[PDB]
Subunit: 254 residues, 6 copies
């Protein structure tokens, strides 16, 4: 592969917590040149349709700063029309975070997750999900430490990674060139206990077999596991009680 990386090998991964001061939780995550700021802010309110249902909510906003993929990704501000792509990913990030949290125990508040891609080189959505978790966990731990909530109702770790078939090779965690040249690309969102939260496989004018899907899913689950091993070094958990470890940054040895 271009970067001299193996086929079943992730790019250098780095996760830095406490990136910013104001959010209850925040981090700067990077998969290679792909960099995303993930923040988690508590809003002392809930969406109208949940009012009074004794439950919290998590929702997410994703944005790709104009300078992405070394090209131009002009925001949704000084422009107009909005892409259902940004929306597709925001919904993805939202589903991943809610699956990992027992919202029953968050109280009637909302964790507003913001994922700001400050540099894109493929895998930006899976990088955002991986980072968003750390920011959400930190934010729940912060809320607990402040006494706003009784426990730290986090069910499990959540991470995500991309995989694809390029020139008939199954590659793990694709950068932008590999993805634009892929016959089949795929995003996988997994949990700490080895389960799955989401899987989206797409043939790019090429079809694939059930077996190729499984091969890809197998490689992705291994990628997810390595990412979760990194995330794990950031926490100290016991019987459902979460505390942050003393690490402020964790990175892959690659």
């Amino acid at each position: 592969r271009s970067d001299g990386r193996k086929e079943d090998q992730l790019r250098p991964v780095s996760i830095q917590r406490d990136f910013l001061e104001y959010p209850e939780g925040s981090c700067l995550i990077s998969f290679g040149k792909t960099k995303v700021i993930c923040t988690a802010s508590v809003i002392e309110n809930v969406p109208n349709w949940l009012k009074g249902k004794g439950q919290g909510w998590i929702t997410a906003e994703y944005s790709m700063l104009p300078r992405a993929t070394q090209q131009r990704t002009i925001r949704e501000s000084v422009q107009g029309r909005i892409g259902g792509r940004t929306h597709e990913i925001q919904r993805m990030i939202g589903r991943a975070m809610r699956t990992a949290v027992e919202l029953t125990k968050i109280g009637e508040r909302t964790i507003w997750v913001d994922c700001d891609v400050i540099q894109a080189d493929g895998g930006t959505a899976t990088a955002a999900i991986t980072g968003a978790f750390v920011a959400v966990a930190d934010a729940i731990i912060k809320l607990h430490k402040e006494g706003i909530i009784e426990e730290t109702p986090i069910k499990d770790f959540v991470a995500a990674v991309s995989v694809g078939i390029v020139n008939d090779r199954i590659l793990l965690d694709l950068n932008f060139e590999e993805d634009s040249a892929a016959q089949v690309d795929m995003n996988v969102v997994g949990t700490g206990s080895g389960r799955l939260s989401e899987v989206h496989t797409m043939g790019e004018e090429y079809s694939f077999t059930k077996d190729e899907l499984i091969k890809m899913l197998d490689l992705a689950q291994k990628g997810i596991n390595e990412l979760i091993e990194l995330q794990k070094k950031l926490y100290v958990i016991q019987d459902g009680k979460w505390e942050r470890s003393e690490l402020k940054e964790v990175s892959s040895t690659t």
Copy 2:
């Protein structure tokens, strides 16, 4: 199940070609109460980025008439903001159609696919993909018969179906109630030769296992096969040459 249907059983399916006169291809497809009008219109032009590249294009527009799911699905007209959901599905339908067609041989024109859901009861997106194919195939056959193009460059049939886990039961082709009550729902897009074009599995605040994904994918591929057997009765193909059969409508015996 509510409708007395089995777990590995599709709802009554009906596909009617030549539903409208003006489009090069058109049909009314129905999966139960879910009904979608699928039309395919040729536009003698191409997207700027393809100009001169000796190739055709296929793109799709999906809309859900206000009266859907027995509720209100107010269009994107007399309103304002647009959902990335409509966009997510339009992109899905577009990918499915392009995968099934050798665009090299369509010439520099575009097949504009319109999917109009006139009644929603779950599975509307997979129903639209299933119907869109018939309209695209008919339209290519029509273009051939008119002498606009040399052959009928259709690679294979394409159909799609939903599957999910509801109250820990794996169900095929979900209606709206089963889907809103599902722990995991999934859309699968497959081909004539038994391959896959797309798979999207989503945990709805529940995670799942690789094996459950495979069980679901297995049930879906069987569903896809039954839908493609129906579609097949509408065509007579030999060595890549496509002609319409004499059927104007095909329906499942259920």
Copy 3:
């Protein structure tokens, strides 16, 4: 005339009730190649400005599926700006339905009328009004049969037709070619008892005389009457009590 039709002759008309299952009322109407799906759905609420005024409301949404007039009528979704034309017609349809109904007796609910043009060849707005009535009447009858309301407060039938001056000939019910070539075109909305609800005459860079307006209005009222004779076969009315006849479809003998 192109289609071999006489000057004071309507195109073949067809009205099919119960086209869809979910709406309280629904039909597929066609004036030649012009086809419109008209549905009427009850929303158990009212516009804020009517709250508590012991009255119901009727409002309408009109849309022209991209494939219309054998050309491209891209919706208001994956685009942006909205035309005051769609709005002009929605307001027209709304005025026609409210005139035909004693809203005092509908209770505080709204009949949401949806007119979806699935094929356009001129006269689409008058076709929608003609069809919308049948869907609204059926919906009121349905509400009565369900016991939601005491009576069937329908004042009279409502239908509409276009007329114009083309190459100095006064033609009834124009298709798309006649209308684009017309010096003066006009839409007329009339009632069962031979009265008028709306009339809009427009010189297309040509002016006309009071007498020509009357000639046109006379031809239109005859057209309206024929359309209302068709609609009438769909109902059995006595002393203001409306019941559906046993016909599911009615068509002109032409």
Copy 4:
């Protein structure tokens, strides 16, 4: 009537030409408290679809300054959604101006008509059409005087007025209260030679008869004639050559 005005009587009318300096043509017209600034500006270009067709174009923009009808008519700027009503009227004004001008002889340029309602008390659209004509005529005369065009290709005067049925009385030129209380209201656009350009009659939850329409149309044509007699004092015409008279303002004696 409220203002002590007769049923077949217009409000005090005033037309002032040369209201502004920059536009080729401009005026401030008033029907009672209804006041509209009408300007006509030449743009040395044409809409793409007319390029090279040896013809000019006229199009119009209508706006209702927030302070209208003594209430709030917040513009389309610091808001968002646009009403098809503004559009309906802009199209009306456009049709009226083009009918009155032989566009063949204007050259490939466009007369951009701007109608700015600075005070609304009913009849604002008909007032705008009445005023827009004067601004368009002046602008064509100005273009001629500057040598940009050979002649003054104006076919005839154009004016417009409203009429309605209120408490079963047929009233001419309605103010805002009469119009909101009307059973049937109507806008009529007529020419110098007594012909018609447009007529739009609308039952407001009340239907009407062919004869009532004629009575109303008769009253309107008389109103149109009085307005055109005023406009006429502003010009000196002979064999199709138009020159401005020496009047800068003309008003009705009422």
Copy 5:
């Protein structure tokens, strides 16, 4: 200078109160060819965030009718995207009016200020502020005379003017040509007692010195004073009680 005007000389200024009848306050102001209609309307309500805070509010809407600067300034209606420029000026006008009024004493109502530029030749924003004051003062006086409020809580006069450096000359009140050719342009908003409310100086690809800023500010304050001397002739004030003088129009002797 082009118009034969001196460097420290304003263009001919004219202010006409009672321009329209419906607004509580209104005027037509002109700085040369720059003309702006300024109206002030009372809305018996307040912005949600002020509800119950025993205070009034003033906000402003600015619009530039398509015919401005002898060019085309197409509104925000039949277009789409909005400029932050219109917003920048609306905020400016809002700040100027609120500074001049003791909102504590207006009650819980809002003065809606509308500034409609009907002709642009530079200095349109400062002209609007100058005119908006007169309309706001008149409106407060009107509210007092109607007994809606106890006193006339107007703190002081407010006026504004532009100044710039053109070909290294410091000019007062620039028309459109001088401003587009300026190296540095500036808007100043001042009060009756010689104080300042706002100052915005902008280098147009040229930088300037603190001293040049002061020279410009000095010239502007003299301009502001002359404009306020004009405004003053429109009122008769004593111990904070404001009454209108008998002048309906005031103009500079130039």
Copy 6:
């Protein structure tokens, strides 16, 4: 002051160049808790109105990530309406950068400046201008080193700072609390040689004197000078030739 800072004292300032890899120039700047990512990307094209005029262009995009001022600043994406405030600042940043660059010598390309506020505590716009310069200078130096352009046509350093009057005290560089409580706030944009590019002073319902403006401007120019002394350590310049120093980060000793 709250933070124990003096009245004529800036918050701790930090500027880090090469923050990201893809942009030709980039940095993370911080004034206290106020943090902004500033990137400069070259687009090998120019705005249509400049085509062929042998000149380059600089334009800017500013955005405030939802998590700002410890509150919610929801972007312009999944929302709709846009604020003229974002636009006001983008125009400010654009004017500052163009003033500092001899665009004649950049060739026909555009430097696209992106300012992404990742944490807001007042002074975010002046912080963005201060940071944007460093990114633009680096980008021009980068373009030179790559041989795309002959020289490094940078005229001078540009920096900006806020100042205000709070409880009658003139404070330098205000955080969010001081600014919301200020009677008069002001933004100043200055150059390396001690000149000014922009000054915007705004009374917040309070007026001020020419002398207070000068006092504030004096304090700001001292602030600008300190910021420019920091920026200066990042470059080594001689006779108009710019090279980066070896520092990657520079911070104030405070």
